[model samples]
Target chain A: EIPIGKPQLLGGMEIAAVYLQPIEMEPEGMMRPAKDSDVHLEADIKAAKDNTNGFAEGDWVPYLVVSYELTHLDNGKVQKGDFMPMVANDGPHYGDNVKLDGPGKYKLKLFVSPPSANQHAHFGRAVDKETGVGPWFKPVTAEYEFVYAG
Target chain B: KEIPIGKPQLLGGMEIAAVYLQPIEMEPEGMMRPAKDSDVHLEADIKAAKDNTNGFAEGDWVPYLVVSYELTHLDNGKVQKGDFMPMVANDGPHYGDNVKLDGPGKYKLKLFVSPPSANQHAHFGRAVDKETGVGPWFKPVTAEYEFVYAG
Candidate 1:
């Protein structure tokens, strides 16, 4: 027999925060570097299992989850919604669930110039200068989790 | 409990597509060629936002609101969510229910950008050049709607 577990969202589980990194730049200006900013992303997710019939028409299903390291204002005081990773795409739009691996610490950097105008067309490619562009960015990993019926 | 929403008698149709250019300082040489990475224009259904349901109390009319960005088209090449150009339009008032303002006064258009998405912050990127390996750039897309509440 399968053990039925209570829906996590039933207790008001929702996205708490999000972090965005700054465009990073290099030293000599030949190539761009990554600027790390810590960002806090928050959202309200209404789960399907919580509703009648175990599903609803307009329910937010968990997909690609992202985690980031926050920056500090003085020594370690990071602003909200700052600092992120280099790549943040969930495979196949709904294929695999994101698993957050963490020491709970990472660095996100961004560059100023654009990589090549289409670098983003393909997910998970580093933005370069001359060959890539600025606004180059990366992320720091702090916390992350997944969603599924247990 | 069923409530019938009011319908517009004469619905004005307005169709448009616009490309917003980002802020770029011209190089001294001024040899700027239009590079295509991810540029897009919108194909939207601009319509009225008035109370049509007779259920509402009489004489209380809802002001005109333009809900846009329903459909979008690709830039030089075809790719959605990449290199989106900002745009706006002046879709006429909601048909039927007549509610008029004074003259040609600039109505405030409230805008909200980067609304919550899945689990990450949404970033708009463009492809400027592929050969030189310099693309998939990022920039903020923004716009404003100016309407004169007249006639």
Candidate 2:
């Protein structure tokens, strides 16, 4: 899910609220500056388990898809997609299972899958200690720019 | 798959755990304040009833153990006690008045009594609940000692 670009609308009716600031750590000595909630979100999704990318070493089945889009420089667009099935033992290993689900205004796309193709969706440890390789399932996507509550 | 508590030669080894110290009926009848430790302790034990003679008999019921205390102290040395774990049956409280024995390495303040007459217990009640003001009437009875140990 490394799409990372394309899907930018900008202009959420003057913005009312939207917070997904989960980036964990990067501040030390020098008056302390870096703070977007510390920046860190990668739940060691056990690398599609050898199905590598074609999915077959164990199949790939773990889900957490979230799709949303809304546009209104005067009311003209709306889109929605929802999914949540994260059970390689429920964890945000490298952490970020920040599920909000309520409070309007949108623009977000996050994907992570492989909970069935044979078996291998472990999402439980990824801060990469050198090659301790932890983003288990093969699908990680993110996009953000928000506003909610008008 | 063996569930039957109706015999073991009729429970001779004895083991029971009970609770019902409930009391809050609006708490306004007064007089329960002066316990920084008047020693506060109460015990019970029985085993002599075979059939009437006050030896015990009248639908027979037993078991009355107490550490009966309703304390309140807080402003830092903080202490709040209302200890509860009762399995009393039949009317309650009054085994032989002031029994004792919570010493020698202290069994963490033990309390067990169930053989006053043992017929399981006849009937008991202490209720009062006006929309959750609290229920279970009140009764206080205590006396047990053999002190000395402070450091």
Q: What is the DockQ of each candidate?
A: 0.04, 0.01
Segments in model 1 whose C-alpha atoms lie over 4 Å from true places: A1-9, A12-46, A49-87, A91-150, B1-104, B108-137
- For model 2 the interface RMSD, in Å, equals 31.6
Model 2 spans > 4 angstroms off: A1-58, A63-65, A68-76, A86-110, A113-123, A126-133, A136-150, B1-151
Angstrom error of the Cα, residue B132, model 1: value is 25
- Model 1 RMSD, rounded to 1 decimal: 20.2
- lDDT per residue for candidate 1 within A40-147, as digits (tens), equals 122223333333212232333222233233342224434222222221221011111112223333322211111122422211111222211122222222233322
Docking class of 1: incorrect
Q: Write the per-residue lDDT of candidate 2 for residues A2-111, one digit (tens) a residue.
A: 21234322211010112223322211121112242221123232222233222222211223332333332234344443322111111112223233334444455544
Q: In candidate 1, what are the lDDT values of residues B18-50, reduced to their tens digit?
A: 222222211111112122321211122222123
